[PDB]
Design a binder for this molecule. Structure first.
Ligand code: CLA
Ligand code: CLA
Ligand code: CLA
Ligand code: CLA
Ligand code: CLA
Ligand code: CLA
Ligand code: CLA
Ligand SMILES: CCCCCCCCCCCCCCCC(=O)OC[C@H](COP(=O)(O)OC[C@@H](O)CO)OC(=O)CCCCCCCCCCCCCCC
Ligand SMILES: CC1=C(/C=C/C(C)=C/C=C/C(C)=C/C=C/C=C(C)/C=C/C=C(C)/C=C/C2=C[C@H](C)[C@H](O)CC2(C)C)C(C)(C)C[C@@H](O)C1
Ligand SMILES: CC1=C(/C=C/C(C)=C/C=C/C(C)=C/C=C/C=C(C)/C=C/C=C(C)/C=C/C2=C(C)CCCC2(C)C)C(C)(C)CCC1
Ligand SMILES: CC1=C(C/C=C(\C)CCC[C@H](C)CCC[C@H](C)CCCC(C)C)C(=O)c2ccccc2C1=O
Lengths: 175, 154, 741, 169, 38, 74
């Protein structure tokens, strides 16, 4: 088939940035129109890369003035040390701006099919910010793959709690 | 006889009755209970509720009556929400009249009342604010009323 | 034969036709030149058998709409599990159920209505549940709030599968009619797959969740030392202590040594006197009996393998001589029209719901259900009213089949139209039975009314007066007393305590008492026989005279919702098959109003109430039925006046919302009457006399303001008569028994 | 201007204050010229209002107030002191002459190419040039930080000017 | 494109508007409860 | 308590008789050619304003008794 897999030759995709192939084993791109799922994939991969760099960069031990972390999960100490400061409310609220103001009509550009549904502009780079053919696709695959490994790797960075109850640096100090 | 309400005795008996009767529910919970905090805020909403009726006229029942003469000592009871209310439904009436005399001359007026032209609707929604001297200036123009519309036999 | 033939990518999923209201009907996409276009937009919104005659497109529309209904039901049940999770005192209720009144909904604190938050114990207030969800959850074995949050989450997930399901089955994979008229397979999968695997897998839940948990709660363990339901399946050693038959595994099952499963499964009946509900051993054994018996029942329909029946060769073989042709034709009747199937399924669904109501008062199946009487009351009452309305839908949709989808060619001399050949002899003997039962069911109340009013109480129909002891009900009730030793041989206790032995007291509250039926209960049963025969008179008159009456010999040409024919024949107002459904809804309100008034007053005099020491008895009304149900002054005084005292004195207290739903539901009731008595020939030029006052000020509405149509203008009178009249009894019942139970 | 192709609404690029920004397409259905005149008028009156929150220093306290740098119930202080109704009368006596049609969406007085009334310009060194383009920003920044003053009165509640040096919560 | 035309119909605008005025009254009766003056 | 209620129900019955025979007068007894633009023909001319304003005051009182009783009762 067109897939480097069992069999489904080009169900609806095939030109998307799968450099190793188009994966798609289950019937989502059968009926979901694929532009919605692409905007969801890219938005999840961006926010998951922010999540994993959040967990690691916080596990390098930095606070203005707060408690000892011992974790970056488990809501009261970390999360509701932050909420009771009256502090995460705005860091949610500005994203409540961002998605409704510049993500919702952006998603309307993901309605009509005139977007390439990532693309919030945003290349503040010289000598390497190619919007064209080569580096846009092979770097968009970089954002895509590092975002997917950010999704799963953030999955493990959450789920090392039961036999650990410690930091992931302390998980590296354990076997 | 309309006593001033801040010194009516049976009125203050209703104060003692609702504060204490509502406090009978407060005798179930501990000092940090959210229910108990809600009845703290509720007792606040009873003492404020009764101190903010200090200029009404609660008669022999201890219940705050009103006055609709426009005495100007009781204008805050009725005539000020009267003028306020007639402003609000003169707004609504003027918006509805202006919008209907828009869509009376469109392509498909039957479709215009199902599917509101939110362009022209929210044009008139806001534009009917100065309706006393817009109806007074359309009424002098011979445009507010009509003449020789439908009627039955005789 | 059997195969799956499904069109893919049928209807585009654009929002384009939302901008054309009334796109669906070619008789209605003209646009509103009148306001009657508005209301006909909604009454024709689900005439799926009246958009287009093509049964394929209709059948796609309905089968996709079902998933919308199940989407709303899963949103609703996920609402109940989340309101049980976040808002309820269920974890506190699980500690002591007989003390803490059940509540979920915690009213937002705005002006005054914070007084509706009833202090129901559990350290948290809110308006009290009478739906009895907590008794369903203790039977389910839900321990802490996490299973309620998770099951609400799965409720939303199944709601998403139903929205995406119906979207997927109208638009981008929608089946052919050959898929729909595969009815041997539809029964073959509902009798087995839906109901069979439902009851079997539910027996799996009850055995591996509810039996260990509601053994631990029957011992009285707080829900902290109880392990997870989960943690009973990882090892049998947590269940072999509770039931030692789990130690033997499934080996006594496959060796047919089913004596060994007497611990898990049994046939006891009665009620567990600790929890006041059924023994869940009996209930799990019960669902295994529905399991094997329905899974056997599924395999009687030949689909692909030439093994089983078809419906055709069954129905054609019942060619009895008094019908002549036999059932030749019904398989073509019931596989081409949907209103016929809706008549049957609504009739059996509603009557099943009444059966549900009776089997929930007299065999209370949930733990601590008969100890909080409002949940005991209203779960009787509510399944009566959907138990009622769904019957009238039968009388609607058996009428509609006779009007719309009837066809005399396929339906010639069979069992169906041979009724219509003597429908005068049907309706005439319903007419005689209605008058005979009306005299002998209500004239007894006027009789005892006068004899008590004339002083001659010896001439009444009391206990002491001319007795009318119901002989047959007392006799077969005595057979049910003599059940568990004689004929139900392997039983231990009776089928219920509404039949036999001494009552069940659970926390000084009477679970079930042996109901005595004497000489007043007789006459209320003849009320019920009467008002069931009147609705059967109107709803068989609405089906047999649905198509060609001898008054109007073309109703099939006029339609189903026509108002009338005219003033000719001396006036033929309210003559359609719809109009008999219009009357069957009022008589529904009558028949069920006196079913529940029979319930909620005989079971406040002969069952419910409290007990004191030395086994003493104390009902809520205190035995005040048989001396007082025989009249109507005793009825209206001792029930509708005396039981109002806890509804009417409810102001200032937490029941006061019912005191608002008592008055306003009177309002809506009387507000119905304006639509019933008047007619649109008044309102149309009353309205047009107001249209003069808009044309004078140029506020002429472009959509021309007609009055309501006749069938609408009476349909709204029914729909306020039932909301007002039903919500009066709703707030009267729940305001009555919460102040006691 | 706005990069993800969402920028051909009912608006026009040669309009003053333009930097290509209507994500929620308010230019549809809301009469872009009237939205422009509301932006200009909100910018100028918020501009003067934050100029009151700039010249809350000791200068020009002429005999009536005696309440320096309050910014909260100072509104209530002159509801109590009277003559705040009177400035609605005076502003009404302006807005008879300024707009002359004075109805919000019905009959907007579009005659002179620009949302600016009667040509209030006695100095008149610039005309309606691209100075318009640098008026609107000097209104827009005058809007937002104006809120930043009053919210500094809301939850900080300390002082308008005394956040800037080394004063942080 | 036509979704806003569905959001411009009579009941949808009537609920997005009566929901809004109902929100004006409910939010204006938490903030200022028991308002019998003025 | 019975004389008052007696004469009030008889009072309402006889008003409704006066208007019922009013309508019988306007159907089976009315001649608008002997009543050429008469006071009665004037009444039938502005009957639209009459019924619109009766419907107005009846609507106003029905939203301002029932409004105040449901207010006081809530
Ligand atoms: C377009 C708005 C509008 C306007 C200006 C009027 C104006 C009038 N109506 Mg009215 N009316 C309206 C809509 C309107 N109506 C609607 C929609 C209905 C159906 C419910 C009625 C039903 C009605 C009756 C039954 C009667 C009047 C009467 C009257 C007159 C007396 C004032 C009164 O009591 O109002 C009555 C007000 C109501 C019954 C309720 C208010 C109506 C709506 C809810 C408020 C307007 C909002 C409107 C929907 C906004 C649409 C435009 C917007 C979307 C842009 C007055 C000329 C009376 C009359 O003839 O007196 C001379 C009379 O008896 N009206
Ligand atoms: C054994 C398989 C099976 C099961 C479990 C069901 C179950 C159901 N059918 Mg159904 N059906 C089946 C086979 C089955 N059907 C077949 C073979 C046919 C063709 C002859 C039909 C034709 C049919 C029609 C025409 C209609 C139904 C309807 C219903 C629902 C009744 C409402 C109810 O009880 O709510 C209880 C609800 C539940 C218990 C939820 C169950 C949902 C889970 C996910 C099981 C569903 C299994 C599903 C078929 C898997 C799809 C396979 C696909 C992925 C390849 C119920 C969900 C009615 C309905 O409401 O439409 C939905 C309806 O109108 N069925
Ligand atoms: C309280 C009001 C009331 C009463 C008494 C009835 C009574 C009746 N309705 Mg009914 N009905 C009512 C309201 C009422 N309806 C309303 C509101 C609706 C609106 C939906 C309907 C709609 C309706 C339909 C659609 C039908 C009926 C029918 C019937 C009859 C059923 C047969 C029966 O009971 O005979 C027994 C009679 C009684 C119980 C009445 C009391 C008579 C007493 C017991 C004996 C006689 C008293 C006395 C001795 C008279 C002689 C003395 C006198 C001459 C001085 C019955 C006469 C059915 C019908 O016409 O044929 C069966 C029918 O099809 N009704
Ligand atoms: C600094 C902000 C600023 C700027 C750049 C402008 C600019 C302009 N305004 Mg303007 N305006 C402003 C604030 C401003 N306005 C305020 C606050 C008000 C409310 C009173 C107005 C009210 C107003 C009206 C009523 C009209 C204009 C008009 C105009 C245009 C031509 C007039 C002119 O020569 O102005 C040039 C302006 C400047 C060079 C700004 C000088 C800044 C001084 C030095 C500030 C002094 C502050 C001091 C401490 C007190 C021009 C684009 C006219 C128009 O639109 O044309 C039809 C017109 O009719 N304006
Ligand atoms: C659509 C009508 C509407 C309007 C105009 C407002 C307006 C407002 N809400 Mg609000 N609100 C609404 C509906 C509405 N709300 C609904 C439906 C909910 C339930 C989800 C809330 C829940 C809500 C909360 C929880 C809060 C507000 C707050 C506020 C105020 C913020 C400034 C403002 C007055 C805030 C406020 O000022 O309260 C202190 C606040 O904390 N609202
Ligand atoms: C139609 C008759 C009628 C009238 C005249 C009133 C009048 C009043 N009711 Mg009311 N009420 C009525 C029917 C009526 N009610 C009914 C039928 C019910 C049952 C649903 C209620 C239930 C009810 C409750 C539960 C409460 C009231 C309250 C009030 C008072 C303040 C209303 C309010 O929220 O102000 C606040 C609203 C505003 C300030 C909004 C006006 C601002 C405008 C729109 C802004 C634009 C200005 C330009 C006011 C005296 C409240 C009270 O304290 O009683 C005295 C109160 O708590 N009413
Ligand atoms: C409870 C019974 C009831 C009620 C309330 C009414 C009420 C009314 N009738 Mg009436 N009527 C009744 C029984 C009733 N009737 C009966 C039994 C008959 C004999 C058939 C008549 C015969 C009759 C005639 C012949 C006439 C009336 C008219 C009227 C209106 C008089 C004007 C007025 O007061 O408007 C005030 C409005 C009200 C009192 C309506 C109630 C307010 C509602 C409940 C609030 C709005 C809805 C609310 C928000 C709830 C929302 C519902 C939810 C689903 C969303 C009024 C609507 C006349 C008319 O049209 O006048 C203009 C007229 O000519 N009636
Ligand atoms: C039910 C018993 C009814 C006796 C029907 C006798 C019966 O079922 O015979 C069966 C007979 C049909 O005879 P066939 O041999 O044609 O039947 C085979 C076919 O019907 C099926 O293909 O049905 C009728 O003739 C119905 C006659 C109406 C009889 C009127 C009485 C029915 C209404 C009375 C309800 C009484 C309830 C009393 C409870 C105690
Ligand atoms: C790109 C964009 C910006 C940049 C925006 C950000 C800063 C770019 C950076 C993005 C980062 C965050 C990408 C993240 C990728 C995924 C991370 C690296 C996951 C790593 C996990 C790996 C290490 C596996 C980890 C196993 C996880 C497993 C659970 C066990 O525990 C063991 C263990 C730790 C080995 C600018 C501004 C800088 C430039 C602009 O032009 C555009
Ligand atoms: C206090 C007083 C007074 C006053 C009073 C008055 C005078 C009142 C008025 C009122 C009145 C006095 C009114 C009247 C009423 C009446 C009525 C009630 C009417 C109506 C009518 C009817 C009912 C009918 C109708 C009709 C018709 C419909 C048709 C034809 C015509 C007719 C008319 C017949 C006086 C001054 C004495 C003095 C002092 C004391
Ligand atoms: C009162 C009455 C009417 C009149 C009912 C009128 C026409 C309908 C009143 C309710 C409508 C829905 C009011 C219209 C209001 C619109 C919804 C817009 C208002 C703005 C908001 C509420 C959205 C009949 O048409 C009728 C017909 C046949 C027998 C009896 C009767 C009858 O008793």
């Amino acid at each position: 088939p067109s897939m480097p897999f069992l069999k489904r030759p080009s169900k609806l995709d095939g030109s998307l940035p799968g450099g190793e192939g188009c994966f798609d084993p289950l019937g989502f791109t059968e009926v979901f129109s694929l532009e919605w799922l692409r905007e969801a994939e890219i938005k999840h991969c961006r926010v998951a890369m922010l999540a994993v760099l959040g967990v690691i960069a916080q596990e390098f031990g930095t606070f203005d003035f707060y408690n000892a972390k011992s974790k970056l999960q488990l809501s009261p100490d970390l999360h509701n040390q932050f909420v009771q400061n009256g502090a995460l409310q705005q860091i949610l609220l500005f994203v409540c701006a961002w998605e409704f103001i510049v993500g919702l009509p952006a998603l309307i550009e993901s309605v009509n099919g005139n977007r390439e549904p990532g693309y919030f502009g945003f290349d503040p780079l010289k000598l390497g910010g190619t919007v064209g053919s080569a580096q846009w696709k092979r770097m968009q695959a970089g954002e895509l793959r590092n975002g997917r490994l950010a999704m799963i790797a953030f999955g493990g960075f959450f789920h090392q709690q039961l036999l650990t109850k410690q930091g992931i640096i302390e998980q590296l100090a354990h076997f | 006889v309309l006593t001033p309400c801040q010194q009516s005795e049976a009125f203050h008996k209703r104060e003692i009755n609702e504060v204490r009767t509502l406090e009978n529910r407060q005798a179930n919970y501990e000092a940090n209970s959210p229910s108990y905090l809600a009845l703290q805020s509720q007792i606040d909403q009873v003492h404020k509720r009764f101190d903010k009726y200090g200029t009404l006229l609660c008669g022999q029942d201890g219940l705050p009556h009103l006055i609709t003469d426009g005495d100007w000592r009781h204008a805050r009871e009725f005539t000020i929400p009267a003028l306020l209310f007639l402003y609000i439904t003169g707004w609504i009436g003027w918006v509805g009249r202006s919008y209907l005399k828009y869509t009376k001359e469109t392509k498909n007026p039957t479709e215009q009342e199902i599917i509101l032209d939110v362009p022209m609707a929210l044009k008139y929604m806001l534009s009917g604010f100065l309706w006393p001297l817009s109806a007074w200036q359309e009424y002098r123009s011979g445009q507010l009323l009509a003449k020789e519309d439908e009627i039955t036999v005789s | 034969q059997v195969k799956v033939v499904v069109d893919r990518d049928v209807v585009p999923t654009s929002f384009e036709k939302w901008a054309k209201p009334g796109h669906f009907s070619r008789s209605l996409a003209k646009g509103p030149k009148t306001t009657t276009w508005i209301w006909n937009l909604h009454a024709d919104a689900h005439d799926f058998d009246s958009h287009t005659s093509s049964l394929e497109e209709v059948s796609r529309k309905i089968f996709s709409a079902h998933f919308g209904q199940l989407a709303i039901i899963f949103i609703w049940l996920s609402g109940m599990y989340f309101h049980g999770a976040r808002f309820s005192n269920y974890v506190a209720w699980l500690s002591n159920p007989t003390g803490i009144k059940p509540s979920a909904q915690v009213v937002w604190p705005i002006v005054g209505q914070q007084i509706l938050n009833a202090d129901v114990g559990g350290g948290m207030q809110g308006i009290q549940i009478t739906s009895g969800l907590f008794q369903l959850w203790r039977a389910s074995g839900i321990v802490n709030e996490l299973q309620l949050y998770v099951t609400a989450l799965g409720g939303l997930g199944m709601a998403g599968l139903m929205i995406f399901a119906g979207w997927f089955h109208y638009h981008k994979a929608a089946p052919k009619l050959e898929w729909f008229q595969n009815v041997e397979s539809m029964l073959n999968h509902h009798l087995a797959g839906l109901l069979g695997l439902g009851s079997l897998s539910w027996a799996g839940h009850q055995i591996h969740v509810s039996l260990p948990i509601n053994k631990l709660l029957d011992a009285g363990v707080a829900p902290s030392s109880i392990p997870l339901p989960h943690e009973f399946i990882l090892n049998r050693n947590l269940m072999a202590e509770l039931y030692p038959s789990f130690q033997q595994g499934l080996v006594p099952f496959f060796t047919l040594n089913w004596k060994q499963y007497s611990d898990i499964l049994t046939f006891k009946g009665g009620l567990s006197p600790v929890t006041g509900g059924l023994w869940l051993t009996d209930v799990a054994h019960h669902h295994l009996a529905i399991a094997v018996l329905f899974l056997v029942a599924g395999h009687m329909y030949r689909t692909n393998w030439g093994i089983g029946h078809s419906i055709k060769q069954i129905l054609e073989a019942h060619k009895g001589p008094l019908t002549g042709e036999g059932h030749k034709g019904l398989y073509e009747i019931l596989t081409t029209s949907w209103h016929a199937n809706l008549a049957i399924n609504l009739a059996m669904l509603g009557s099943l719901s009444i059966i549900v109501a009776h089997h929930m008062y007299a065999m209370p199946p949930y733990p601590y259900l008969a100890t909080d009487y409002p949940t005991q009351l209203s779960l009787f009452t509510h399944h009566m009213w959907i138990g009622g309305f769904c019957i009238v839908g039968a009388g609607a949709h058996a009428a509609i089949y006779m009007v719309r989808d009837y066809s005399p060619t396929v339906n010639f001399n069979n069992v169906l139209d041979r009724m219509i050949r003597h429908r005068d002899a049907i309706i005439s003997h319903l007419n005689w039975v209605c008058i005979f039962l009306g005299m002998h069911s209500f004239g007894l109340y006027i009789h005892n009314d006068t004899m008590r009013a004339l002083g001659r109480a010896q001439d009444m129909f009391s206990d002491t007066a001319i007795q009318l002891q119901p002989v047959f009900a007392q006799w077969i009730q005595q057979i049910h007393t003599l059940a568990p030793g004689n004929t139900a041989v392997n039983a231990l206790a009776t089928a219920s305590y509404a039949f036999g032995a001494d009552t069940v007291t659970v926390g000084s509250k009477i679970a079930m008492m042996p109901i005595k039926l004497g000489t007043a209960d007789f006459m209320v049963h003849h009320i019920h026989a009467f008002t069931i025969h009147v609705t059967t008179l109107i709803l068989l008159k609405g089906v047999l005279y649905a198509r060609n009456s001898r008054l109007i010999p073309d109703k099939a040409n006029l339609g189903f919702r026509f108002p009338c024919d005219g003033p000719g024949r001396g006036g033929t107002c309210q003559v359609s098959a719809w109009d008999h459904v219009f009357l069957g809804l009022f008589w529904m309100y009558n028949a069920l109003s006196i079913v529940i008034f029979h319930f909620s007053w005989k079971m406040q005099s002969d069952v419910w109430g409290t007990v004191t020491s030395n086994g003493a008895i104390s009902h809520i009304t205190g035995g005040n039925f048989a001396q007082s149900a025989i009249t109507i002054n005793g009825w209206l005084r001792d029930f509708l006046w005396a039981q109002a005292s806890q509804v009417i004195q409810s102001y200032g207290s937490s029941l006061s919302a019912y005191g608002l739903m008592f008055l306003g539901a009177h309002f809506v009731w009387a507000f119905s009457l304006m639509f019933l008595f008047s007619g649109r020939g008044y309102w149309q030029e009353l309205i047009e006399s107001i249209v003069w006052a808009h044309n004078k000020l140029k506020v002429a509405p472009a959509i021309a303001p007609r009055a309501l149509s006749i069938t609408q203008g009476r349909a709204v009178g029914v729909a306020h008569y039932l909301l007002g009249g039903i919500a009066t009894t709703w707030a009267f019942f729940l305001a009555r028994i919460i102040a006691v139970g | 201007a706005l990069p993800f192709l969402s920028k051909p609404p009912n608006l026009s690029p040669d309009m003053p204050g333009y930097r290509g920004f209507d994500p929620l397409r308010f230019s549809d259905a809301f009469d872009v010229n009237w939205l422009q005149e509301g932006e200009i008028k909100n910018g100028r009156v918020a501009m003067l209002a934050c100029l009151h929150f700039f010249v809350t220093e000791f200068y020009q306290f002429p005999f009536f107030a005696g309440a320096p740098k309050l910014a909260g119930p100072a509104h209530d202080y002159f509801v109590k002191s009277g003559a705040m109704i009177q400035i609605l009368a005076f502003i009404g006596f302006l807005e008879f002459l300024l707009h002359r049609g004075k109805v919000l969406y019905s009959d907007m007085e579009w005659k002179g190419r620009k949302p600016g009334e009667l040509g209030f310009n006695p100095l008149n060194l610039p005309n309606d040039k691209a100075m318009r383009d640098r008026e609107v920003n000097n209104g827009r920044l005058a809007m937002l930080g104006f809120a930043g003053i009053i919210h500094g009165e809301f939850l900080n509640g300390k002082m308008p000017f005394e956040q800037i040096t080394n004063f942080q919560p | 494109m036509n979704l806003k035309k569905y959001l411009s119909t009579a009941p949808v605008v009537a609920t997005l508007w009566l929901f809004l005025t109902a929100g004006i009254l409910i939010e204006l009766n938490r903030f200022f409860p028991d308002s019998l003056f003025y | 308590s019975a004389l008052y209620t007696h004469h009030q129900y008889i009072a309402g019955l006889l008003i409704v008789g006066a208007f019922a025979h009013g309508a019988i007068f306007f159907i089976r007894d009315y001649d608008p050619e002997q009543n050429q633009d008469n006071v009665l023909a004037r009444m039938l001319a502005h009957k639209e304003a009459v019924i619109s304003h009766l419907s107005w005051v009846s609507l106003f009182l029905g939203f301002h008794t029932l409004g105040l009783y449901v207010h006081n009762d809530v």
